[PDB]
């Protein structure tokens, strides 16, 4: 059947905003995963997982009698899709069980690993999510093999449909770089937001860049992709060498023996794929990657044998039975065990990407330190494994269960505990009046609270107004945040705060994070008053102020809004149309299409635009909360045309006289063009909609202010 | 960005079941359009519509000073997408304002028509939907031009995103037949469920079949497509001749002057399209279809001039100024007015498809009767226009406002009024006990009630258990309904009914429609008891029994289930895979994916399969309500393979011994294969889910039993 996407392939897709409806979710509307998990007997689950590790199933026999390496790979891949650029991917929604990830070539045979876990998932039911189980199983694998993990948190709720992620524009799995949809340009610059070198890979190609087996060049791709997953050189080396202490790769015959990935397989395969015609198709005859390497002399036990071998041998370029490039130790004895035949031994082998850890000069220094000091290696790997598997969980308030690490880590963007009484409703009313009496305007108050709260993204639950990091580097200097204007507002609010806090007894105080939010609430109430409407905007106290020393400035860079349609802002000139960037932002804010439409039309008339731009300010009563954006945009008495200076800026002129009435950008005018967004704009632009517009604006403003409030969940 | 649909283009799409979530809808979840409409000042709206008729806007000037013809075409096209095969399309959801229908070539310039209505829509807001406004406007246009309509009902709630409809597989707008994706095969056989001859047309091609100007062959296409829109020969002739009494076509210059359709146009177009470079691009210069025909001497007034012209001249083939085929009256004088210049007159003209009404011998006889008896033509056209514009509205209980016709029409599948006391809870308990004492089994009771209720489709709100039409022709004879089994159940039920009704006082009686549904509820209660669960299934009385004379047997044929996955039934071997047909059926029943999952898994173990087929009966306790279907389908101890006899039946064998344990169809096994359906099956097959399964099944059963109960809404 031909679809709208077929006819109009470039038209904007609003379906990304309407996933996760209560329709698609089999659990009741009142289901609370955290409540279920908190009563899980986690120790019993781990005892079951420990038993599974050495209980081989004949349909996918265990290498060395132990599934631990397979499960570590499973958990690593679940987490390894994460990109810092947008926060998308990662292990936090259990997306490896859905398309496309369930069928990426790098996930081959993890379908078998997940099937091995069905009996335990079935036993525990709703009290452990697939998402949590996949990570837990990797931790139990590590523990079972002698490695002390840093800890584990539950709380990843399951999802029920595929996430909408841009994974690249190639139409061929694993396509080498430089094709018509190349993800590389310039001097090997990978396009943002991508974090893998080839479509369907987790990070890098194990044979080397585009298949060229050069460890020094491979190291470049490792460093770039791991940095795009938030890992530095020490963490990178720890992870790779730590992982490759365990298990083996699978390449026993040619890859042409392997059939369809799971999403392409026949119905009889019952959700599995990569069925192999090579010999028994499994076990000793398995084919996964096509490589055939076993890294250590004890693949089922933690050791420091990976670095002993990497540094203790010289390496020769060789081919696996499937034809893939890999390396074997020159002159070595057969010291590596075979996975099924106790009478066979093999020489040490390595991937090109393993040899990167020795031939790249900066990695070599770390690797040598880890070789000489294996305790340092173990601690770095434990810490990096925790970070990897938790990076997208969000604030520490979301962490559940008895094994949560007590150490607070800088990468968690930590928020101090609150140790004093909070303001009550009468205090909040007193503070809103003080804020309005200061002379701060509706535009100032709205713009500041919007800047603080709108850094949130639901993909990895980073950002938001909690912390008051807007006052700190780097947020206080972002161009979108209007740094001189911001400084002036924050000075005024900090004086209000000092005066209120100095007058209290009993230790009650207000944080600056809460006062920034409350001040924005006062601005919205005042704008409603300016329109003739008395409303109260909800406010929940309890945010705390983080320090500069508790803030990693480099990690915060990815949260800079370079396109924020809600403030009519674009930092530079981009390939992707601005309207598509607005819908991307709305999805990170967790907004529906109706919510995005109300919010933007309100912000326009409140004065939230960066630079006091008049684009989209379709009112003669700025700083009053009215529906004038929608009534004016939809007025057929105005004709619109792109300007000669800039095709992305439009003039609205009276159709009869030619008089200039307005200007707007693509972000403004999409609401009068897109057939679905225009239908929404019509509801809010109708003669009966003033009350509705106000109510719905207040509700979506309060939603945005609370996005990071997992302390109240 | 490459998507899952790109990678796996034949995989099943479950998003069709989760449209219309509260997420995409701007109105609150409690908004009730019927309540809003019932307080609209309908008379005020009609005065405004009357004013609009002759208020010409310079950006799309009115032909003859009166927009009535444009508006009639607008309303006709809103209704004209309807297909009796699935009930999809039609005016009832206002879908002409969304993709793709807003941009079909046959809807060209109806963007202008709908934009002319924005000020009225704005003024009345949520109290009149777009869907009702488009029909009301057509009615007012007719009234304004001197034609008395049969009536009007409101109640078409607006929708907020495109409907998922199969419109064909062609990849080229208007493609002629016989291409790679041809909708025709054999002797001009149109593929079900389509009801138009070319992609982007409403019914037929005005130049003739595939552009060949043969009125006799055109007639064949008109008859077939109108029958597929529920119209017979008399209704067809009345509608075409009635419509073409008014207005004109637009073809003033070559079609190459017309630019992008609305969904392709630039942002500055603000939702309009087909901008024309020909002269002024509008009014006298308009280009819509490419034809240049004006049918009557008074295009803005009801007349009997259509048939006077059709019969009063002989016709010559000619070309419009765009090159399209049309007909002109031989030796006529210039009697037809010009739309803009009072000094120009034109000869009478006709389309090929108008000439069909004279040169097809069965239409000729109707046309002549209408020409000789214009009162008959007027009444037929009024009735047909009502039917056209109301066909998809469902039972008369949904009809709102002060202009609803009192006459009950056969096509409405009428249900008699209930005029007696209904059974109460103590009566329902007595009847359930009598049903269970009769010896009717769980399988018989479930299967019968399922057969009665599951004819409902939400697309046109036809079908369901109200009316007890299961006892009448043709439902009692459908193969899916197991006619001999059904007769025996009905005989037993009608004897229960007779005995209960004979024992009452005060006029109380139970209908057979109610008893069929109540008996099914007793079967579900009994099956829960058989599993050790105490369950009460809700029941709402008030259904009535319709007569055979209230049941048009030909119109009922389209409701016959030729695929019903819920009963593991397929009537024949089809091109579309059976799991796609199950999702299609789920969508007509208004079910979400979780609801479809629970329902199907329960029905399998209750014995609802046609012919007592063992396919998908994955239990050793048939007729007990358990989650066995899920637990056994997901057991990895079983391996599945298609049979040699039939690739569409699968055998599930013990993996270790080879022994046969079960058989299933594609409909059974998709729940273990599709990655989203299997995630749902996992929830219900977990060890904690037996109670959840029973409660969820009861809810979805009740849902299906009440789909047609608009008497309770
Ligand atoms: Na994420
Ligand atoms: Na319909």
From Swiss-Prot, chains A, B:
GO terms for biological process: cellular response to hydrogen peroxide; hydrogen peroxide catabolic process. Its EC number is 1.11.1.21. This is Catalase-peroxidase. One of its GO terms (molecular function) is metal ion binding. It is an enzyme of class 1 (oxidoreductase). InterPro entries: Catalase_peroxidase (IPR000763), Haem_peroxidase (IPR002016), Haem_peroxidase_sf (IPR010255), Peroxidases_AS (IPR019794), Peroxidases_heam-ligand_BS (IPR019793). Formation of the three residue Trp-Tyr-Met cross-link is important for the catalase, but not the peroxidase activity of the enzyme. The record marks 73 as: Transition state stabilizer. There is a cross-link at residues 76-203 (Tryptophyl-tyrosyl-methioninium (Trp-Tyr) (with M-244)). Keywords: Heme, Hydrogen peroxide, Iron, Metal-binding, Oxidoreductase, Peroxidase. Bifunctional enzyme with both catalase and broad-spectrum peroxidase activity. The keyword Iron applies. It catalyses: H2O2 + AH2 = A + 2 H2O; 2 H2O2 = O2 + 2 H2O. The keyword Hydrolase does not apply. It comes from Burkholderia pseudomallei (strain 1710b). Binds 1 heme b (iron(II)-protoporphyrin IX) group per dimer. Homodimer or homotetramer. Belongs to the peroxidase family. Peroxidase/catalase subfamily. The active site is at residue 77. Heme b binds at residue 244. One of its GO terms (cellular component) is cytosol. Its cofactor is heme b.
């Amino acid at each position: 059947g031909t679809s709208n996407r077929d006819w109009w392939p470039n038209q904007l897709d609003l379906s990304i905003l309407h996933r996760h409806s209560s329709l698609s979710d089999p659990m009741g509307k009142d289901f609370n995963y955290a409540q279920a998990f908190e009563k899980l007997d986690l120790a019993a689950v781990k005892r079951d997982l420990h038993a599974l590790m050495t209980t081989s199933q004949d349909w996918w026999p265990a290498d060395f009698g132990h599934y631990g390496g397979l499960f570590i790979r499973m958990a690593w891949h679940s987490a390894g899709t994460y990109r810092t650029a947008d926060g998308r991917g990662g292990a936090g929604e259990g997306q490896q069980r859905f398309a496309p990830l369930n069928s990426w070539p790098d996930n081959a045979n993890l379908d078998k690993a997940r099937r091995l876990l069905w009996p335990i998932k079935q036993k525990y039911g709703r009290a452990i999510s697939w998402a949590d189980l996949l990570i837990l199983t990797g931790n139990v694998a590590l523990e079972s093999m002698g490695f002390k993990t840093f800890g584990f948190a539950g709380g990843r709720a399951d999802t029920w449909e595929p996430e909408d992620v841009y994974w690249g524009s190639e139409k061929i799995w694993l396509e080498l770089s430089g094709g018509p949809n190349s993800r590389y340009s310039g001097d090997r610059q990978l396009e943002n937001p991508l974090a893998a070198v080839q479509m369907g890979l987790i990070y890098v190609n194990p044979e080397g860049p585009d298949g060229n087996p050069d460890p020094v060049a491979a190291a470049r791709d490792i460093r770039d992709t791991f940095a795009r997953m938030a890992m530095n050189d020490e963490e990178t080396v720890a992870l790779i060498a730590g992982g490759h202490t365990f298990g083996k790769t699978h390449g026993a015959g040619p890859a042409s023996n392997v059939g369809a990935e799971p999403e392409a397989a026949g119905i009889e395969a019952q959700g599995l794929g990569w069925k192999s015609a090579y010999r028994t198709g499994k076990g000793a005859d398995a084919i996964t990657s096509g490589l055939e390497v076993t890294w250590t002399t004890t693949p089922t036990q933690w050791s420091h044998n990976f670095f002993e071998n990497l540094f203790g041998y010289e390496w020769e370029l060789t081919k696996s039975p499937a034809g893939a490039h890999q390396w074997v130790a020159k002159g070595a004895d057969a010291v590596i065990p075979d996975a099924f035949d106790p009478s066979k031994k093999h020489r040490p082998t390595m991937l090109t990407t393993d040899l990167s850890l020795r031939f790249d000069p900066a990695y070599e220094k770390i690797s040598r330190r880890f070789h000489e000091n294996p305790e340092q290696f173990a601690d770095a790997f434990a810490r990096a494994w925790f970070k990897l598997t938790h990076r997208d969980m969000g604030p520490r308030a979301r962490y559940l269960g008895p094994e949560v690490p007590a150490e607070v880590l800088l990468w968690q963007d930590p928020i101090p505990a609150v140790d004093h009484p909070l303001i009550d409703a009468a205090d909040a009313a007193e503070l809103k009046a003080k804020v309005l009496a200061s002379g701060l305007t509706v535009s100032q108050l709205v713009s500041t609270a919007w800047a603080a709260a709108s850094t949130f993204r639901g993909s990895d639950k980073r950002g938001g107004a909690n912390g008051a990091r807007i006052r700190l580097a780097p947020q206080k200097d972002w161009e979108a945040n209007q740094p001189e204007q911001l400084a002036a507002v924050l000075e005024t609010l900090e004086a209000i705060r000092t005066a209120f806090n100095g007058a209290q007894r009993g230790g009650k105080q207000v944080s600056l994070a809460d006062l920034i939010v409350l001040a924005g609430c006062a601005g919205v109430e005042q704008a409603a008053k300016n329109a003739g409407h008395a409303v109260t905007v909800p406010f929940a106290p309890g945010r705390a102020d983080a320090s500069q020393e508790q803030t990693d400035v480099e990690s915060m860079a990815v949260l800079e809004p370079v396109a924020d349609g809600f403030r009519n802002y674009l930092k530079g000139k981009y390939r992707v149309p601005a309207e598509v960037l607005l819908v991307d932002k709305a999805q990170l804010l967790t907004l529906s299409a109706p919510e995005m439409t109300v919010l933007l039309g309100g912000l326009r008339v409140l004065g939230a635009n960066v630079g006091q731009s008049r684009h989209g300010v379709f009112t003669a009563r700025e700083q009053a909360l009215t529906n004038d954006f929608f009534v004016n945009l939809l007025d057929m008495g105005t004709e619109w045309k792109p300007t000669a200076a800039d095709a992305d800026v439009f003039e609205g002129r009276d159709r009869a006289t030619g008089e200039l009435k307005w200007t707007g950008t693509r972000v403004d005018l999409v609401f009068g063009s897109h057939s679905q967004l225009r239908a929404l704009a019509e509801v809010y632009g109708s003669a009966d909609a003033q009350e509705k517009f106000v109510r719905d604006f207040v509700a979506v403003w309060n939603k945005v202010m609370n996005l990071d409030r997992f302390d109240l969940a």
